């Protein structure tokens, strides 16, 4: 009897909605309206890395806040030195259709993936003096969209087959898989404790996973279009997403509901990246309007603008110590702001 | 300074190698091969001799690169921007089907990224299409047709119906009824690519 199942599912959804709405006594704006603003923020470029040739898509920082990594459609994956604008490595790829790159926290491995449905791992501390492929991970049915390191032995990967998996590099076997989504998964963020992670797909929804046990704990259904970015709050009890609706929203894990929206009438372009600050007061979000914006987290108003790119800002990132912020673009250029 | 001059020399060598590699690799033409299912793409690809298949060959001192992305069952909007700056498209249509092909062609021609990219059109399976049109008329799929029941008029009607979906004067479409021939597809592609590169050079020089 599918009718009874649908009716009980609808009843459960209504009960969930009522319970969620029963704990909304106040809002963030009313509490926060009694604090001083931050004024205006003026940032200027300091470095310009010009080595790539076509449409850099992904970038990532290192744990020492001194080394970078970049990937482009030209088929090259090179790592930079921010302080002296130098090049220290240059790794050629078998497939030129790459979309992601990750840096291991220890600094011994780098990973990349793309349209070939394969995640590759490179070793940077070989005794022969050259970087060589260590393992090739396969098993996904669709394209890859993100990859983050947990330690020097296991990795997490989100793909376009509406699924996520946890791997073991020592043997190349998919340990645990995660199912429950409907559309293509595009974003993935890791908690500071490395015991939970959230993801967002194209069905205008997001959910939290447990690494130890492959179960889903909560679900959020705020936006109305495809989610493209996600990032945990530095405290670890909140996160902010970004969609093609030209909006950004903040969610709370303990309350399980939205708190604020970041939108303006003069912005129509979508969001391609999102990042926080060291204290969590600032929020940086790249746009399709060839520029980026800085917004107050607790006040929901614009507090600056960054210009200088002639194409899409496809990636963003902030150092561990919060010293600088890096931006990448389709114009094959990288900039460091302070 | 310190021994950092060795690192500077390493960076200079890396930059020189990158420039040389880019110059060497910037001398090829890339083509997309979008189409329908069971449209005959594999047959012509093999005749010309899960992820992405990239077959390539050399004809008359020109290096080609063909990309087939039919193995991925996902929304096309997610990865259609990756194939920008492509020279042309090799859209293929079978005459023995068809509405899905027209819908896909209309969607492709009206895309924002491909507003200034030429399209080569191929119509396969001419002999068995003639046999079928002898067996049954074209009114089964095109009730609005009013002409006779021969082959040339039906081919012209189908070509006109496919061509009418264009909405940009800057686009050029090259139609062709291959009839499962041999050693003609390369010539047609070569002529089209020659025209495209001549136009691109004229535009780059400032004469457009």
């Amino acid at each position: 009897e599918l009718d009874q199942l649908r009716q009980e599912a609808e009843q459960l959804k209504n009960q969930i909605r009522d319970a969620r709405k029963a704990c909304a006594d106040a809002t963030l704006s009313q509490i926060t309206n009694n604090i001083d603003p931050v004024g205006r923020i003026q940032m200027r470029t300091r470095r310009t890395l010009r080595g790539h040739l076509a449409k850099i898509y992904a970038m990532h920082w290192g744990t020492d806040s001194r080394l970078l990594v970049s990937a482009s459609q030209d088929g090259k994956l090179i790592i930079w030195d921010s302080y002296t604008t130098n090049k220290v490595h240059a790794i050629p790829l078998r497939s030129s259709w790459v979309m992601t790159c990750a840096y291991a926290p220890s600094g011994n491995y780098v990973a990349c993936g793309g349209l070939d449905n394969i995640c590759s791992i490179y070793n940077l501390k070989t005794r022969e003096g050259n970087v060589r492929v260590s393992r090739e991970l396969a098993g996904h049915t669709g394209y890859l969209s993100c990859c983050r390191f947990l330690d020097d032995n296991q990795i997490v990967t989100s793909s376009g087959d509406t699924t996520c998996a946890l791997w073991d590099i020592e043997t190349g076997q998919q340990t645990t898989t995660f199912t429950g989504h409907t559309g293509d998964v595009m974003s993935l963020s890791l908690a500071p404790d490395t015991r939970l992670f959230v993801s967002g797909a194209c069905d205008a929804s997001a959910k939290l996973w447990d690494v130890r046990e492959g179960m889903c704990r909560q679900t959020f259904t705020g936006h109305e279009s495809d989610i493209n970015a996600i990032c945990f709050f530095p405290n670890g009890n909140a996160f902010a997403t970004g969609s093609d609706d030209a909006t950004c929203r903040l969610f709370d894990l303990r309350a399980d509901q939205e708190l604020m929206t970041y939108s303006h009438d003069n912005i129509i372009c979508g969001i391609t990246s999102v990042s926080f600050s060291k204290s969590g007061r600032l929020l940086l979000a790249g746009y399709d309007d060839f520029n980026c914006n800085v917004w107050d987290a607790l006040k929901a108003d614009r507090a600056g603008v960054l210009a200088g790119h002639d194409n899409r800002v496809s990636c963003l990132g902030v150092t561990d110590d919060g010293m600088a912020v890096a931006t990448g673009s389709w114009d094959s250029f990288l900039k460091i702001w302070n | 300074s310190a021994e950092e001059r060795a690192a500077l020399e390493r960076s200079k060598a890396i930059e020189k190698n990158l420039k040389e590699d880019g110059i060497s690799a910037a001398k090829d033409v890339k083509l997309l091969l979008l189409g329908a299912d069971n449209s005959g793409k594999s047959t012509i690809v093999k005749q010309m001799k899960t992820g992405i298949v990239e077959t390539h060959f050399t004809f008359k001192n020109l290096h080609f690169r063909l990309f087939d992305v039919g193995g991925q069952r996902s929304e096309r909007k997610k990865w259609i921007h990756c194939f920008e700056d492509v020279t042309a498209i090799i859209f293929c249509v079978d005459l023995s089907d068809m509405h899905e092909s027209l819908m896909l062609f209309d969607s492709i021609c009206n895309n924002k990224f491909f507003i200034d990219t030429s399209i080569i059109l191929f119509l396969n399976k001419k002999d068995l299409f003639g046999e079928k049109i002898k067996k049954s008329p074209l009114t089964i799929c095109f009730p609005e047709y009013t002409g006779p029941n021969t082959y040339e008029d039906a081919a012209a009607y189908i070509q006109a119906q496919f061509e009418s979906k264009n909405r940009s004067p800057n686009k050029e479409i090259y139609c062709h009824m291959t009839c499962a021939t041999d050693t003609n597809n390369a010539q047609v592609i070569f002529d089209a690519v020659t025209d495209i590169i001549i136009a691109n050079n004229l535009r780059g020089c400032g004469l457009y």
Partner: single-chain antibody
Amino acid sequence: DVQLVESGGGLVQPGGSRKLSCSASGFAFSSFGMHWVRQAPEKGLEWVAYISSGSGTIYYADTVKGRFTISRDDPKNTLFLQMTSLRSEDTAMYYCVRSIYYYGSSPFDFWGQGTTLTVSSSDIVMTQATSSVPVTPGESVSISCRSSKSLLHSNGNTYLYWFLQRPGQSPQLLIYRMSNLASGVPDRFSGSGSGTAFTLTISRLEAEDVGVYYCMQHLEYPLTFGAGTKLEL
């Protein structure tokens, strides 16, 4: 399996000329520099020549300038050293060392074996005020070095190295840049210093740590070594 084998040793009359070869097999030769450290029969190590990757820069010792040449054959993976007008002070054992230079690299990682050569009849000074010291198993020892000019650069890096040469063997690298431990060395060894004074700790001394220790600087291209300290059980 990194390996370096040398050939071209023997007896040379005064005023002659010879050549030395260094064959490499097991690593990327084109991305490494070359050095030609030599050792007297009963004395310390001395530096001779340097060949950069790509044959761009070549440096020579002031004692043999205008008298020797260094060249590299990348396709054949060989290193050459052509010397002319050999004198009576050129008798020594010649070593073949490799090094790579980038942010985080460890130069002087691997050393060759060495070939003998017998002939018939504005600088930085590193001082080691110790020549012999007795030790016992399970105890701790300390070695000190000093320099005339401070090795602490503006960027914050100190250029000091420590080496150990077991009897009848080839020297290896233990500590580079005064704080970093080389790969494969145990954790019993640690180094520290400030300015023109440095110290090495050999706590938990076993029977495999007997030899001579050397301290070297890499601030100026005329590289200089020390006298060394002997540690006998």
